[PDB]
Design a protein around this nucleic acid. Structure first.
Ligand code: HMT
Ligand code: CL
Ligand code: CL
Ligand code: CL
Ligand code: K
Ligand code: MG
Ligand code: MG
Ligand code: MG
Ligand code: MG
Ligand code: MG
Ligand code: MG
Ligand code: MG
Ligand code: MG
Ligand code: MG
Ligand code: MG
Ligand code: MG
Ligand code: MG
Ligand code: MG
Ligand code: MG
Ligand code: MG
Ligand code: MG
Ligand code: MG
Ligand code: MG
Ligand code: MG
Ligand code: MG
Ligand code: MG
Ligand code: MG
Ligand code: MG
Ligand code: MG
Ligand code: MG
Ligand code: MG
Ligand code: MG
Ligand code: MG
Ligand code: MG
Ligand code: MG
Ligand code: MG
Ligand code: MG
Ligand code: MG
Ligand code: MG
Ligand code: NA
Ligand code: NA
Ligand code: NA
Ligand code: NA
Ligand code: NA
Ligand code: NA
Ligand code: NA
Ligand code: NA
Ligand code: NA
Ligand code: NA
Ligand code: NA
Ligand code: NA
Ligand code: NA
Ligand code: NA
Ligand code: NA
Ligand code: NA
Ligand code: NA
Ligand code: SR
Ligand code: SR
Ligand code: SR
Ligand code: SR
Ligand code: SR
Ligand code: SR
Ligand code: SR
Ligand code: SR
Ligand code: SR
Ligand code: SR
Ligand code: SR
Ligand code: SR
Ligand code: SR
Ligand code: SR
Ligand code: SR
Ligand code: SR
Ligand code: SR
Ligand code: SR
Ligand code: SR
Ligand code: SR
Ligand code: SR
Ligand code: SR
Ligand code: SR
Ligand code: SR
Ligand code: SR
Ligand code: SR
Ligand code: SR
Ligand code: SR
Ligand code: SR
Ligand code: SR
Ligand code: SR
Ligand code: SR
Ligand code: SR
Ligand code: SR
Ligand code: SR
Ligand code: SR
Ligand code: SR
Ligand code: SR
Ligand code: SR
Ligand code: SR
Ligand code: SR
Ligand code: SR
Ligand code: SR
Lengths: 73, 237, 56
RNA sequence: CGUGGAAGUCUGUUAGAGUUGGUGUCCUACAAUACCCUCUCGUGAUCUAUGUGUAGGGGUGAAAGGCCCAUCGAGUCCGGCA
RNA sequence: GUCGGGUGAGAACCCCGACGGCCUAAUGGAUAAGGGUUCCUCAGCACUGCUGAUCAGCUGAGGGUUAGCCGGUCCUAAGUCUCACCGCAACUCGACUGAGACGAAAUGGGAAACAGGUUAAUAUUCCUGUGCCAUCAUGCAGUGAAAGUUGACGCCCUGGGGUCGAUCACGCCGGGCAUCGCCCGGUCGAACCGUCCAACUCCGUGGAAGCCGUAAUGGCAGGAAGCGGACGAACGGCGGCAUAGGGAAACGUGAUUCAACCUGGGGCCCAUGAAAAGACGAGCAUGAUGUCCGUACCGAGAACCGACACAGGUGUCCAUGGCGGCGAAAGCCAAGGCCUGUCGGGAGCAACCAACGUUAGGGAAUUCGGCAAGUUAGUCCCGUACCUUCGGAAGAAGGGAUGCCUGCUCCGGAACGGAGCAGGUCGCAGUGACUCGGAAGCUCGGACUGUCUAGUAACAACAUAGGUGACCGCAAAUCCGCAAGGACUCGUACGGUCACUGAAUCCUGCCCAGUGCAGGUAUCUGAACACCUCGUACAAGAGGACGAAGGACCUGUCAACGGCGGGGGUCUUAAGGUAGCGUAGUACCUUGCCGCAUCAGUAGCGGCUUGCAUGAAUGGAUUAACCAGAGCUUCACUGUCCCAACGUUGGGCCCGGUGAACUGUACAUUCCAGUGCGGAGUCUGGAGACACCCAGGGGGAAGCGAAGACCCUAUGGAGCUUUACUGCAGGCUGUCGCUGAGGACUCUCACUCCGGGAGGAGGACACCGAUAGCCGGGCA
RNA sequence: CGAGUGGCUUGCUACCUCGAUGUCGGUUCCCUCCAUCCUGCCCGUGCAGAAGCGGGCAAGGGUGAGGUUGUUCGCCUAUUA
RNA sequence: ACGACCGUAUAGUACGAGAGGAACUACGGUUGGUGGCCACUGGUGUACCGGUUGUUCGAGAGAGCACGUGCCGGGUAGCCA
């Protein structure tokens, strides 16, 4: 997904952008319903195209490893 | 010589100032007397230009539209409670005494009623550990054990926008855009690349610092550059 | 671009204008201060001892 | 295979910005920094008008001691001063 | 520009016609700033105008700018000022906090105007016609009235609606051309009032288990399609406006592509894309009121800035005129403008110079160097290496095609859109002009885009992402201020400050002795105040006790400054150079030795390499991609060269007119020798020498230009450095004052901070005032 | 070992110029010197011849093209009387 | 205002065991320099004639512009090597 960067920047810079944007444009499960319709609106802002649920998550992930630890306690 | 860059900073000129007029809200906790009967519904999720993380727009029972520091997993429609008898749910604000041990908390107050000072940046959190009648020990994002007053309010959950630091800027242009939204002069010219008149490390036929980089705490502004009061330097050892 | 003749072409800004107080073309219309009499800066008229030789 | 149309992406005298070589022309100049051809950038850290801010051992500086009205390793004016 | 002609005492350049040209994002049209009367008329030529002038931006005299609805005015933006408060020795000074005001004329927001006519000069301002807005008054309606909506918004891609324009078809009116029958122009008509509504959203019906839909994404039993309905757009259509206006006349109709304008869908952000006044919400009649300021003209190769009628500089809108073609490209031509990038006449017009064309054979032999020039070129088809970060390299390279004419096929609703087929046919040449890459390889550097010495440096330098270390929990770290206070900060460690290194990949050895920083410290050293001894009827003063930071001492630390040798089979001073790389942009010797390539190679590349004096974030190595960066090789090409020629345009030369400057002790027709402060037109000896003028290229006048920038000298200057001398800020630390109650401790009442408040935290500390010790090129 | 000539190298001196006599190399154009490289005429020879070596007179003419290097210098190639 | 070289005859001769190998003289040419000239070859030749691309004058005919010839082909005189 980093073909827009061409022959520039190097491995790590365009490999880590590819991994992070692949797990961002991916189909994510919604906290309201259960549908895989959550897309990114901006930095940290997420929304489901089904029930119009606009929520807060990580910058590139809708759920961070630390955000899942809050549910435990 | 001429005053160094760090000295021009304090004068507070345009180049060094934050674009305050383009900022949204001073994210503080609400002022409740005693009673807890203050709750509200989340209307929108907005982007905060000051911290590059999301901020939740909440409308309270008494009709007050205020922007609050959004934790992770808070959406439109969700009900948030602020007060002493508040529910132990993510996104609720209640004093450290009422919050159970081992629960990740954010937007912690230093002195009770200040509105929140600690654990405010993207994805970070403070960990509440020990309880007492006098003190509440909170472990701040740096790993420091901060002894605080149990009457200091805090919001449950980790701050939203986690993992921001994980993706590289890739290009100078992306940095440019981030920096235009902060109170920072960017790009950074190395002192070692300057003239002697401009910086203590300036001058020479080649680029290297003058004296050693580790400077004393007692050093005056204009000389305090490089490694400020370093306990040690390097990686090894 | 040269600092001389080619940089003189951009000069179409009005700064110094006829003053309400003294009549000199020294009222800076952007600063709202007169460079000659001090109108806009002081109630007292701008005067200095260096405008003449020391013993005069 | 198609669709899609990303990009400090490419060609480009589009507008616009810049200024590599000719060490050409000029060098009592058209001009106290000009002319011509050539050359570089041209969706971005882009270019630009106007308004506005920072002032002299001070600013401003992607740093050349660059720039702060033809004035800068400390502007200009007058005074100290014959 | 030329031929006629006009006016005039006078005409190359003032005016008329004709002919011939120039300008096409401008040399046209409208404007911002800035100018300030430069605008129009009349009269003039002393001034100004690169010549002349009857002309004029010149001289003189008159005249000229008309607004409810175009701007200002009103609103708020970054931000500015005023007052109060506080600071300051003080103020015309100074940060905060309050309140008030100011801050947008092209180009932020915003109540309302269109069409025509008229002047020498104004014009949405005057006049005619028509329309619109706001306020107020009266009358009718209405009791709703403030919630909400609007004002009001980023970048990229894109659909739909749609006007002007442009073009096509056909008709009408007028013109042009005259083998044809083609070619040009026109065919009009506003604001406003009324009306229509696509998209979006939503409601009812319906009942899809796979269908609906798009350029694309997409949609759905949480209810798809289909059907009906609510809400709802254009500066658009339609009707009025209009037996208004305009036109000599006709006074059209359809279409395509469609700027403006309207309305949707999608994507991006470690970037999140104004505010306020105002409007809507919230009817209608009639009447009244609508003041104040701007309004001329230029807006530039003559009205602005640059001393100038300066080849410079200077913002906005017209980006849809025709052919052309991908095109807002070239080239050509309209509309419109101009012959004022304003001196002319003459000589086949010499030398020489500037721009330039063409040169046989050779083909880089030229030169530091292919500098300069040239070669290549558009489009389609075929085809395409090493290497690589798999993106790229790549238009690699290389090869073929390319016009016109006749008749057609395919894609699409169609284009005056595109892709092809068959036959015919012309030239040396079909991207026929124009437009339009020369190609390949090796090496060095910096990863890349980007930045820079305004005016000799664009680079390898700066920046950059990336790597790393340092400081700080916020009453912080860092920084500004004398103070009151302030930046960072509408910020909080995934932060932001201070530094180093400089993409990726493989890596980053050893050394803490010196220096720096930091931690610790029995003991030693360590100021002042207070305390004790001596001294003095007191005081000066001498000594003692106690002892803070700091120092000694110990430890930690090199991605901290830096270091990584000599000798022998350890010594200095801690270690003794590991991976790598290596005759390097570092190698003195040096053109190192071997090889490659050439006839010949101080070059270049590979290998070796004892490295005068490589080497690991003073980062080492390596590297795809990128480059107006340095060096080298090959193909191609050529006037760079052999070696020069002819030609073209502007000068040069002669004539009319206009008309400077540099320079000048005097004398001066010199030449060869000599002499002289040793580098003489002038002295000495000889030689030569009739005067004046024209053109030339520059040998001499140690030519002209600049009181040498090199060098030295001066008890000269300045910038910069530091373990130079002396001091000054600043930080740390003790002590005294604020400062209180009961060598360690409790408290609360000053004082500080948090809290709107109640009240909470801290607390005689901190802050502040004073003094003392330490550090202290930050500064003098 | 001894005696000299020159004024191309280098060194020495500090006379001339610091109110400036434009620095190397190259190029282009002109004149000159002889201590002659070739060419003309000669003498000797370890001169058969051929080709040379050495010397004398002699400055009329000639003394060229190229590869590395900024180079002067020099190294190298093929031509040349 | 001429300098120099190569070649042929001399001659496979003189000389020399052989290998090798001349000269006087007479001739032909080349090179460098020099002065002049254009019949010949060559260059130029924005005189001229032709072809042809774009655009404008309606087509045709005939023309303008495309840098001082749009480009391409040929090229007289003169001037030249
Ligand atoms: C160190 O060399 C220089 O400084 C050259 C220059 O600066 C040239 C000046 C040229 C000007 C500006 C006068 O045109 C200069 O003044 O030279 C002097 C100069 O300038 C007139 C001439 C001098 C004076 C004696 C003769 N010589 C000739 C040139 C020259 C050359 C030099 C030299 C000195 C001279 C002087 O050092 C070695 O190279
Ligand atoms: Cl950052
Ligand atoms: Cl106006
Ligand atoms: Cl759509
Ligand atoms: K001198
Ligand atoms: Mg806040
Ligand atoms: Mg980082
Ligand atoms: Mg900024
Ligand atoms: Mg930097
Ligand atoms: Mg520097
Ligand atoms: Mg320097
Ligand atoms: Mg310094
Ligand atoms: Mg470095
Ligand atoms: Mg360094
Ligand atoms: Mg500005
Ligand atoms: Mg007149
Ligand atoms: Mg007018
Ligand atoms: Mg003029
Ligand atoms: Mg030739
Ligand atoms: Mg040569
Ligand atoms: Mg070139
Ligand atoms: Mg079809
Ligand atoms: Mg090299
Ligand atoms: Mg670079
Ligand atoms: Mg420069
Ligand atoms: Mg450059
Ligand atoms: Mg960095
Ligand atoms: Mg970093
Ligand atoms: Mg660098
Ligand atoms: Mg080598
Ligand atoms: Mg290291
Ligand atoms: Mg001097
Ligand atoms: Mg000097
Ligand atoms: Mg000094
Ligand atoms: Mg406070
Ligand atoms: Mg100093
Ligand atoms: Mg001279
Ligand atoms: Mg002799
Ligand atoms: Mg001679
Ligand atoms: Na694809
Ligand atoms: Na240029
Ligand atoms: Na560049
Ligand atoms: Na100063
Ligand atoms: Na004239
Ligand atoms: Na309408
Ligand atoms: Na067109
Ligand atoms: Na670029
Ligand atoms: Na050490
Ligand atoms: Na080293
Ligand atoms: Na030529
Ligand atoms: Na001369
Ligand atoms: Na100085
Ligand atoms: Na001698
Ligand atoms: Na020379
Ligand atoms: Na001779
Ligand atoms: Na040579
Ligand atoms: Sr607060
Ligand atoms: Sr706060
Ligand atoms: Sr330095
Ligand atoms: Sr280490
Ligand atoms: Sr300006
Ligand atoms: Sr003032
Ligand atoms: Sr005074
Ligand atoms: Sr680009
Ligand atoms: Sr140059
Ligand atoms: Sr010129
Ligand atoms: Sr010049
Ligand atoms: Sr040229
Ligand atoms: Sr480009
Ligand atoms: Sr003086
Ligand atoms: Sr105009
Ligand atoms: Sr006259
Ligand atoms: Sr006029
Ligand atoms: Sr105002
Ligand atoms: Sr406006
Ligand atoms: Sr359309
Ligand atoms: Sr006008
Ligand atoms: Sr101009
Ligand atoms: Sr210029
Ligand atoms: Sr015309
Ligand atoms: Sr004139
Ligand atoms: Sr020809
Ligand atoms: Sr060459
Ligand atoms: Sr060469
Ligand atoms: Sr080809
Ligand atoms: Sr610049
Ligand atoms: Sr790296
Ligand atoms: Sr140490
Ligand atoms: Sr080694
Ligand atoms: Sr002359
Ligand atoms: Sr000087
Ligand atoms: Sr002689
Ligand atoms: Sr001889
Ligand atoms: Sr020499
Ligand atoms: Sr040598
Ligand atoms: Sr013979
Ligand atoms: Sr024989
Ligand atoms: Sr012509
Ligand atoms: Sr061509």
């Amino acid at each position: 997904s980093s073909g827009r960067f061409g022959a520039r920047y190097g491995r790590v810079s365009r490999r880590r952008v590819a991994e992070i944007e692949s797990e961002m444009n991916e189909d994510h499960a919604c906290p309201n319903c259960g549908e895989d319709r959550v897309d990114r609106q901006g930095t940290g802002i997420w929304q489901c195209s089904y029930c119009d649920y606009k929520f807060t998550g990580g910058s590139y992930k809708p759920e961070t490893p630390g955000g899942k630890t809050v549910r435990r306690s | 010589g001429r005053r160094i860059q760090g000295q021009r900073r304090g004068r507070g000129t345009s180049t060094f100032r934050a674009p305050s007029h383009r900022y949204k809200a001073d994210l503080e906790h609400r002022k409740v007397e005693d009673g807890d009967v203050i709750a509200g519904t989340v209307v929108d999720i907005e982007h905060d230009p000051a911290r590059s993380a999301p901020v939740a727009a909440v409308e309270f029972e008494d009709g007050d539209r205020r922007l609050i520091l959004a934790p992770e997993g808070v959406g439109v429609g969700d009900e948030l409670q602020v007060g002493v008898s508040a529910e132990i749910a993510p996104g609720n604000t209640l004093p450290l005494a009422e919050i159970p041990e081992g629960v990740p908390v954010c937007n912690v107050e230093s002195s009770p009623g200040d509105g929140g000072k600690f654990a405010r940046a993207s994805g970070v959190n403070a960990q509440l550990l020990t309880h007492d009648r006098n003190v509440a020990v909170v472990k701040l994002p740096s790993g420091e054990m901060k002894r605080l007053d149990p009457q200091c309010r805090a919001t449950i959950g980790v701050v939203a926008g986690g993992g921001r630091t994980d993706k590289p800027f890739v290009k100078a242009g992306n940095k440019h855009h981030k920096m235009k939204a902060r109170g920072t002069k960017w790009p950074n010219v190395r002192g070692v690349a300057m003239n002697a008149v401009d910086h203590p490390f300036g001058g020479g036929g080649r680029q290297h610092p003058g004296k050693p980089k580790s400077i004393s705490r007692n050093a005056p502004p204009g000389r305090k550059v490089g490694d400020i009061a370093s306990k040690r330097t390097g990686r090894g050892g | 671009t040269g600092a001389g003749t080619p940089s003189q072409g951009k000069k179409n800004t009005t700064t110094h204008t006829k003053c309400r107080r003294c009549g000199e073309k020294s009222y800076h219309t952007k600063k709202k201060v007169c460079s000659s009499c001090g109108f806009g800066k002081s109630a007292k008229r701008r005067d200095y001892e260096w405008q003449s030789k020391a013993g005069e």
